[PDB]
From a paper:
The Rpd3S complex plays a pivotal role in facilitating local histone deacetylation in the transcribed regions to suppress intragenic transcription initiation. Here, we present the cryo–electron microscopy structures of the budding yeast Rpd3S complex in both its apo and three nucleosome-bound states at atomic resolutions, revealing the exquisite architecture of Rpd3S to well accommodate a mononucleosome without linker DNA. The Rpd3S core, containing a Sin3 Lobe and two NB modules, is a rigid complex and provides three positive-charged anchors (Sin3_HCR and two Rco1_NIDs) to connect nucleosomal DNA. The Rpd3S core reveals a compact architecture composed of three modules: a Sin3 Lobe (Sin3 and Rpd3) and two modules involved in the nucleosome binding (named “NB1” and “NB2,” respectively).
To explore its natural working mechanism, we assembled the Rpd3S complex with endogenous nucleosomes and resolved the cryo–electron microscopy (cryo-EM) structures in three distinct mononucleosome-bound states. In three nucleosome-bound states, the Rpd3S core exhibits three distinct orientations relative to the nucleosome, assisting the sector-shaped deacetylase Rpd3 to locate above the SHL5-6, SHL0-1, or SHL2-3, respectively. When superposed by the Rpd3S core, the nucleosome in state 2 or state 3 undergoes a rotation of ~140° clockwise or counterclockwise from state 1, respectively. In detail, the Sin3_HCR, Rco1′_NID and Rco1_NID bind at SHL5/4/2 in state 1, respectively (left); at SHL1/5/7 in state 2, respectively (middle); and at SHL2/7/1 in state 3, respectively (right). Instead, aided by the auxiliary subunits, the Rpd3 is located above SHL5-6, SHL0-1, or SHL2-3 in state 1, 2, or 3, respectively. Upon nucleosome superposition, the deacetylases in all states are located at the same plane 30 Å away from the nucleosome, potentially engaging in a revolving motion around the vertex of the sector. However, in states 2 and 3, the corresponding distance allows to bind with several lysine residues on H3 or H4 N-terminal tails (middle and right). Upon comparing the structures in three nucleosome-bound states, the rigid core of Rpd3S takes different orientations relative to nucleosome. It suggests that the Rpd3S complex facilitates the deacetylase in achieving the precise position relative to the nucleosome, thereby enabling it function at distinct deacetylation sites.
Author numbering:
A (entry chain h), F (entry chain d): 31 to 124
B (entry chain b): 23 to 102
C (entry chain a): 38 to 135
D (entry chain c): 12 to 118
E (entry chain g): 65 to 118
G (entry chain f): 21 to 101
H (entry chain e): 37 to 134
Write the structure that this text describes.
DNA sequence: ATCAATATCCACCTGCAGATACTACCAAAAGTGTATTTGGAAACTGCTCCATCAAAAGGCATGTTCAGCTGGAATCCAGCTGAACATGCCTTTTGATGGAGCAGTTTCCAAATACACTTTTGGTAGTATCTGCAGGTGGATATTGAT
């Protein structure tokens, strides 16, 4: 009884959102899982470093915002920052 | 044990054609064989280190993925 | 009899192999080479199939990138033939020799 | 009772207790063994002694008695394994290695 | 991006080749993922101008 | 007004061991501190990764040994491994 | 404000930097080119540095921010902490 | 009738002189003004420590020296001794910066 | 083969910034000693995937030939870069000043941890169903290359 968690169903939801009638193979889905894991580890490592530099003991939204700004370029950084900010305000105001 | 002549000359010429090369000298084949053997032993050393640390005998795909990632050559697709 | 001029089949092959995604080395020779190389670090190792598949993907990507760099170093000297000194210059600049 | 420290127990010069504390506080794992700081201290001391011996030989070669960053750079760049361990670092006030291509020389 | 590439090659199902074509053709993605290898991806069709005939 | 720990005195002890009558400037000592910190963080990060891969919760001597082997080349790896092993046996047998 | 200071990197300074690199003969078009390169480099570091400074809610750029930026671009620097 | 060195002599002498030394090769004040101008383009009303600008200077000089070495190699590859912009572009392309 | 003009190295000297050092102290830390808890080593076992043959079958590699075209060597020349001198200008050093911002001190309170409980829910395994696509076949045409 050994499981194996993955982001397959969430990637599938996003795909059905942006392309309602296109599918995806299994190897492309493995590529997408690898991509999500890689970017997650990058952002989390950078935020941990930022928290250590300032002698803080907590990872908050500002650490994630600054890590996003340090990692993504230009268009990507701007739009990701806007998306995350909107998400956090929508979450707290609910 | 010339398993390095297993990489034939037409194979190297195919690899060159994919890279956009239009003409190939005759001394290129030995050079690429040397380069490839260097790269391969560099990767396999760390793969076997990762393996024997875990007290296993079978080299797994994740060991190769880690050995590559530590060289700065991340590889997507075998993360399962 | 019909004969193409030297260089026509070259560009035809270039387009063909840049349109494709296959592997360009045969699998059994590469497997034997990998096992022989691993023979010196530890004896009686086993390999999954996906391990050798990953090694092959990585090696082919590396070599194709090196050949692009070599082609640039060749064109820089006003040639069309790649020679070993172009490979040596590309690797020296990348830092792989230095 | 009488308290002898850990670095003296291991026969080292580097601090074992400080390395233990740095391993704990640095958020690397949730537990830390007893021999890990000893191993790490021994490795760090070995590497420092290697690089310092090379730098001192360079300094005594240029008829000086006191090591400066130039000597550290000359030691690092002249050894294969150090230059390949530290291939991507910049040493302030270090300079470069004297080296002129052969084709640029006259005649 | 990958879906646009897939629909461009008259296909309905994304494969790794389409992911590679999407990544390598965009500046910011190619510069975010400049050091990754996608298995079964291939390369971008590109021949130097000096190698063409005439 | 808070203190600033460093490896100055230990580097000085090692120097007086290998070169009994040579001194060292202050800028070279700053270089040596930077070097020690950098190598420490490298080894500790690699050992943490190794411990995470095997689903272990403890950093032991084997993790440090494997990190040393993965990071240093040839001569350096061999001699560092021998030095650390000797240190650990000397420590436990005391 | 201050504008147009890339010209303060004079031709003799670039010639000296090239001499330390082993270069014997220098084209006349190099200087301009070089300046462009340098500017790009600085813009990539200072940006990162400033991103650290605003994170701590500071207003002065310290040497540690520069060292962190250089390290995160793979250009580690020994001597300043 | 006055003494004149042949072209290339003072250049080699200067190569030896500047490879034997460790000083900085750019004036401090122009570099500081340049750094402040760029920073102002990024965020207004900034300040700087002295060691920060010193670190920036050391890093930038090291970068440019390494680039000039790679450029010299690319130039020698083409059977020249004069470095030209296309060599800088080839070196920066093989390195992976453009 | 010689000579003469320039630049570099070395012996001598000295002023001074820097390394070495107590003294004090002092606060922060490392070591000892228990008690508790839990993660990891040993033992067993099941079952899955890796190594080894067997064995056609045909697609790819190898050796050979011929010829074309490319790389390299040799002249030749012009323009572009180096070397040197005169001028001036702007960087550097030293000192002083204002003062803005950083770092330490204290409060306190909003927010994150730790447990116990309950409800989904996403992931494995069959089990099943359907169909987008890779492989095969025919026919049009786009391109090359010698006349």
């Amino acid at each position: 009884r050994s499981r194996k968690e993955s982001y397959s169903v969430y990637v599938y939801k996003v795909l059905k959102q942006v392309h309602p009638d296109t599918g995806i193979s299994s190897k492309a889905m493995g590529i997408m899982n690898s991509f999500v894991n890689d970017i997650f580890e990058r952002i989390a490592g950078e935020a941990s470093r930022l928290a250590h530099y300032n002698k803080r003991s907590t990872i908050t939204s500002r650490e994630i915002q600054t890590a996003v700004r340090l990692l993504l370029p230009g268009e990507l950084a701007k739009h990701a920052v806007s998306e995350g900010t909107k998400a956090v305000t929508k979450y707290t105001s609910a | 044990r010339d398993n390095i002549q297993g990489i034939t000359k037409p194979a190297i010429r195919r690899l060159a054609r994919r890279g956009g090369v239009k003409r190939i000298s005759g001394l290129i084949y030995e050079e690429t064989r040397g380069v490839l053997k260097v790269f391969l032993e560099n990767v396999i050393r760390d793969a076997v280190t990762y393996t024997e640390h875990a007290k296993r005998k079978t080299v797994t795909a994740m060991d190769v993925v880690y050995a590559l990632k530590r060289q700065g050559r991340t590889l997507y697709g075998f993360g399962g | 009899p019909h004969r193409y001029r030297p260089g026509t089949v070259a560009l035809r092959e270039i387009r063909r192999y840049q349109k494709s995604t296959e592997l360009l080395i045969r699998k059994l020779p590469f497997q034997r080479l990998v096992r022989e190389i691993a023979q010196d670090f530890k004896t009686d190792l086993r390999f999954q199939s996906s391990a050798v598949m990953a090694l092959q993907e990585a090696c082919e990507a590396y070599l194709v990138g090196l050949f692009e760099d070599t082609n640039l170093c060749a064109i820089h000297a006003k040639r069309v033939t790649i020679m070993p000194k172009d490979i040596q210059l590309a690797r020296r600049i990348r830092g792989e020799r230095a | 009772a009488k308290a002898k420290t850990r670095s003296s127990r291991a026969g080292l010069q580097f601090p074992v207790g400080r390395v233990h504390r740095l391993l704990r506080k640095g958020n690397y794992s949730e537990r830390v063994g007893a021999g890990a700081p000893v191993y790490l201290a021994a490795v760090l001391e070995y590497l420092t002694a290697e690089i310092l011996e090379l730098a001192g030989n360079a300094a005594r070669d240029n008829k000086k008695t006191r090591i400066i960053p130039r000597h550290l750079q000359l030691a690092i760049r002249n050894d294969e394994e150090l230059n390949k361990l530290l291939g991507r670092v910049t040493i302030a006030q270090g300079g470069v290695l004297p080296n002129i291509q052969a084709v640029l020389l006259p005649k």
